[PDB]
Amino acid sequence: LVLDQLRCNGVLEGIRICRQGFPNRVVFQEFRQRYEILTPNSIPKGFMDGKQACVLMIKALELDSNLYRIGQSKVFFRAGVLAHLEEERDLKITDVII
């Protein structure tokens, strides 16, 4: 009965699209504002295209090229990548926030 519910509910297909896909996706400017604190020297402090700024940030973060894809208006990430970036961001700010 549990197997039949997992089958009709599409539970395994749902897990697979989370693992095989990119369920985390952030607009270039939001990615900058959230995570530029992780890599503050990575962008020359003048104006820059948000997409190119995100490319520079992701290179300075040295993320594996399979963990992300870059779109027309968003960066896409594998599951759990943004969780790690959030943990690292929280660590940097915890000194100032204390």
Binding site: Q20, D64, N66, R78
Partner: protein, 49 residues
């Protein structure tokens, strides 16, 4: 094959993180040495006080 690809991608991610931390090791030791030297100075100062 899809499961093997996801697994191998995670192993690749873990090895990349280990390599990055292995590179980070040098400056971590330099920092630990400088901060321990500062603590040695501070203990000398506090004993002198």
């Amino acid at each position: 094959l899809d499961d093997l690809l996801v697994d191998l991608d995670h192993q690749r991610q873990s090895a990349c993180n280990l390599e990055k931390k292995q590179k980070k090791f040098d400056q971590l030791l330099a920092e630990e040495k400088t901060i321990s030297a500062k603590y040695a100075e501070e203990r000398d100062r506090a004993e002198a006080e």
